[PDB]
Amino acid sequence: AMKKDSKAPCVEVFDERDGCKAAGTQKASGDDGFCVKVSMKAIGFNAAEAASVTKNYGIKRFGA
Amino acid sequence: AMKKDSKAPCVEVFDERDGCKAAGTQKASGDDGFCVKVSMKAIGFNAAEAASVTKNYGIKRFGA
Amino acid sequence: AFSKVITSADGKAAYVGGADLQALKKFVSEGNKRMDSVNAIVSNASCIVSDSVSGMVCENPSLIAPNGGVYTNRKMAACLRDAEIILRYVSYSLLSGDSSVLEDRCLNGLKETYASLGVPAAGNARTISIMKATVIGFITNNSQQKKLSTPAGDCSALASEVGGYFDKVSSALA
Amino acid sequence: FSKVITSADGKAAYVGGADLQALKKFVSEGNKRMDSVNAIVSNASCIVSDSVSGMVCENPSLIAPNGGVYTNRKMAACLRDAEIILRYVSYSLLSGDSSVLEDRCLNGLKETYASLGVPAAGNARTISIMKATVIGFITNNSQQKKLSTPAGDCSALASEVGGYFDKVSSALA
Ligand SMILES: *CCC1=C(C)C(=O)N/C1=C\c1[nH]c(/C=C2\N=C(C[C@H]3NC(=O)C([C@H](*)C)=C3C)C(C)=C2CCC(=O)O)c(CCC(=O)O)c1C
Ligand SMILES: *CCC1=C(C)C(=O)N/C1=C\c1[nH]c(/C=C2\N=C(C[C@H]3NC(=O)C([C@H](*)C)=C3C)C(C)=C2CCC(=O)O)c(CCC(=O)O)c1C
Ligand SMILES: *[C@@H](C)[C@H]1/C(=C/C2=NC(=C\c3[nH]c(C[C@H]4NC(=O)C(C=C)=C4C)c(C)c3CCC(=O)O)/C(CCC(=O)O)=C2C)NC(=O)[C@@H]1C
Ligand SMILES: *[C@@H](C)[C@H]1/C(=C/C2=NC(=C\c3[nH]c(C[C@H]4NC(=O)C(C=C)=C4C)c(C)c3CCC(=O)O)/C(CCC(=O)O)=C2C)NC(=O)[C@@H]1C
Ligand SMILES: *[C@@H](C)[C@H]1/C(=C/C2=NC(=C\c3[nH]c(C[C@H]4NC(=O)C(C=C)=C4C)c(C)c3CCC(=O)O)/C(CCC(=O)O)=C2C)NC(=O)[C@@H]1C
Ligand SMILES: *[C@@H](C)[C@H]1/C(=C/C2=NC(=C\c3[nH]c(C[C@H]4NC(=O)C(C=C)=C4C)c(C)c3CCC(=O)O)/C(CCC(=O)O)=C2C)NC(=O)[C@@H]1C
Ligand SMILES: *[C@H](C)[C@H]1/C(=C/C2=NC(=C\c3[nH]c(C[C@H]4NC(=O)C(C=C)=C4C)c(C)c3CCC(=O)O)/C(CCC(=O)O)=C2C)NC(=O)[C@@H]1C
Ligand SMILES: *[C@H](C)[C@H]1/C(=C/C2=NC(=C\c3[nH]c(C[C@H]4NC(=O)C(C=C)=C4C)c(C)c3CCC(=O)O)/C(CCC(=O)O)=C2C)NC(=O)[C@@H]1C
């Protein structure tokens, strides 16, 4: 059932084959540069983006 | 002196005059809807955005 | 694999790399292109959502007038949030190669909720159709401002698949 | 907000209510100023990405091997610095002065960039575009997004923030 709690799967994909590693970020076993992360997070309200869309909805962006 | 620690003043400006309040966000004294927050934060690397610029730098955006 | 995350009380993150990720990419079709496809959605989630909601409004601007579905920033923000929620469940369907969780945790009861609140179905239908169009545009190199940083090739099968997940949403909310 | 910055404490300061009403008396055009700071920080990502992109598109050698932003780390570090600089400029505009920008961002930066091979021409193009973009928002000359403000004249704040960018340009020329 849809729980009404705003929580959704937040998927993150990583391709780090240049070998640039940020400290603290090794969370699974591997040395080929690839990782997938999934968490369940409440998706927040974004007042700034709501303000912007309310003002700017009538502008065609990105050659759409 | 520039401390070489990547830290910069991160300013957030809040205009909540429409009366929409989020639980756990009252951090100052006032009822007029206005607030300014400032913290010093290390500015992080965004590999996804670096990748995007590397691919997409030659497309003019935003009527620029 | 990530199913524990969907059901955990607090949804703390799970990670898959190395040999476990090698295995994962074998159980879904076109694993490498599929990961690029999921990355395209989540890396661009903000613009996908804002462009789609903006287009629903520019086609029917009574939605932001009084009595309109996204009048006031509180409602606008709630709509943008929902569109991101839906997009994120679609992203997870494409990662996993099936729609069980989208159907169960996102769509089950959602129409009934929108009908009780008065969320306009015609607006919802247009927001979804634009998100669908935008995601497929990215995956098929038809996005005009930004292209994906991938090896060149054909992703048409993944475009059809993600389109089918969006159609599950459109059908549920019709 | 000097406490926040003087110390590396890392803690946030908040000001609202009559306190913020008073603080806005100590800088000119308080309300338009807060709109101007908000425009900078709300659009920080796109201001930075458009300015660094413009850098590269006028000198695409910068992303060839041996170029200033070849590899993802070097590009990412450059985007990071551009955002650092923009944020110190946003703080100068909030406070009406450039003391922190000078002491904590510019002081020693020319010499660091000389050591590390961060090219001055590229920096100059990125700063000029960030300056143009920020002034564009504040003056209703941005084309894809407009601010949600009353219509009015913000030319004085545009000239003030332009002067902050010019302090950066002069330091790094
Ligand atoms: C934050 C993104 C944005 C929105 C949204 C908006 O409405 N305007 C936005 C950005 C913006 N950019 C400029 C000005 C310039 N941008 C560039 C870089 C691009 N030009 C290229 O040739 C290129 C590579 C192909 C780019 C990438 C440049 C060069 C400028 C001009 C700088 C100058 O000296 O004048 C502005 C200012 C207003 C405008 O439309 O030009 C804004 C608001
Ligand atoms: C994520 C932002 C983005 C980038 C970056 C990029 O390169 N393309 C991007 C978005 C994108 N949008 C579409 C398709 C549509 N967008 C809209 C809404 C806008 N049109 C309006 O009339 C309107 C108000 C004035 C808008 C705002 C619409 C209607 C579509 C078409 C939907 C449809 O049913 O086809 C795409 C798809 C590719 C394209 O260029 O059309 C993309 C990639
Ligand atoms: C209602 C759903 C709105 C909405 C409100 C949100 N505000 C969020 C963060 C936030 N807002 C303020 C300003 C507020 N706090 C005060 O102390 C005062 C004045 C004395 C005011 C006017 C602050 C300081 C903060 C951040 C708190 C901090 O940094 O510690 C917020 C974020 C919650 C989250 O990210 O999960 C929300 C949702 N947002 C909307 O879209 C509608 C219109
Ligand atoms: C070097 C400075 C790069 C850079 C790398 C960053 N990665 C960040 C987050 C991150 N990366 C991974 C993948 C990595 N961890 C693993 O366990 C595996 C394989 C088993 C790999 C390939 C993960 C999982 C994460 C998130 C860490 C977590 O969820 O706890 C990261 C932080 C991003 C931020 O602070 O916003 C960085 C900086 N980024 C760059 O731009 C250069 C090119
Ligand atoms: C439609 C989606 C795109 C398109 C995508 C392609 N990707 C191709 C190969 C490929 N992508 C990755 C990275 C991916 N694999 C992972 O495990 C993760 C992170 C966990 C990522 C982000 C890899 C490793 C590969 C193999 C090739 C390589 O590394 O150079 C690809 C070539 C065909 C294939 O291998 O199936 C395509 C076409 N390309 C397009 O033009 C549209 C826009
Ligand atoms: C260039 C800056 C802009 C321009 C901005 C204007 N803002 C005006 C009045 C105004 N703005 C606010 C919000 C502001 N004050 C705060 O304390 C905070 C949050 C902490 C913010 C975001 C207020 C409260 C006001 C006064 C009440 C109102 O007018 O709604 C304004 C009118 C002139 C003036 O009051 O000085 C202007 C022109 N307008 C433009 O066209 C460019 C893009
Ligand atoms: C955007 C394209 C729509 C629009 C959306 C609105 N939804 C509103 C409230 C709302 N939405 C949900 C479903 C959401 N919560 C979840 O947990 C999940 C899935 C896990 C989803 C997709 C709920 C439960 C609620 C009410 C409870 C809550 O918000 O926490 C909403 C506010 C409506 C109102 O208050 O009258 C809006 C505006 N509205 C539109 O016009 C366009 C078409
Ligand atoms: C972008 C428009 C440039 C570009 C910039 C690069 N900067 C690089 C490294 C770097 N930048 C700083 C200064 C930065 N750190 C701070 O703490 C502050 C202010 C508080 C500033 C503005 C430092 C100290 C460093 C080296 C240490 C680090 O990376 O954390 C950089 C990488 C150089 C290297 O790896 O040695 C680049 C590419 N490069 C360009 O070509 C355009 C013009």
Author numbering:
A (entry chain J), B (entry chain A): 1 to 64
C (entry chain D): 4 to 177
D (entry chain B): 5 to 177
Sentences reproduced from the published study:
Cryptophyte algae have a unique phycobiliprotein light-harvesting antenna that fills a spectral gap in chlorophyll absorption from photosystems. We show that the cryptophyte Hemiselmis andersenii expresses an energetically complex antenna comprising three distinct spectrotypes of phycobiliprotein, each composed of two αβ protomers but with different quaternary structures arising from a diverse α subunit family. We report crystal structures of the major phycobiliprotein from each spectrotype. We propose that the macromolecular organization of the cryptophyte antenna consists of bulk open and open-braced forms that transfer excitations to photosystems via this bridging closed form phycobiliprotein.
Four new structures of HaPE555 were determined (resolutions: 1.57 Å, 1.67 Å, 1.73 Å and 1.95 Å). The largest peak of HaPE555 (555 A) is by far the most abundant PBP constituting approximately 63% of the overall protein complement (with other HaPE555 spectrotype peaks contributing 8%). All five crystal forms of protein HaPE555 are constructed from continuous filaments of PBPs, which are organized into two-dimensional rafts. The filaments are generated via knobs-into-holes packing but differ in the distances between adjacent molecules along the filament (having either tight or loose interfaces). This packing brings the chromophores of neighboring PBPs closer together increasing the possibility of energy transfer. The bulk antenna proteins, HaPE555 and HaPE560, are densely packed to form a concentrated glass of proteins as evidenced by electron micrographs and FRAP experiments. It is also possible that the rafts of HaPE555 filaments seen in all crystal forms are part of the organizing principle of the antenna architecture. We have shown that HaPE555 and HaPE560 form the bulk of the light harvesting antenna (roughly 6/7 of the PBPs) and capture the highest energy photons. Thus, HaPE555 and HaPE560 have evolved to capture photons that would be otherwise lost by the integral membrane photosystems: they plug a spectral hole.
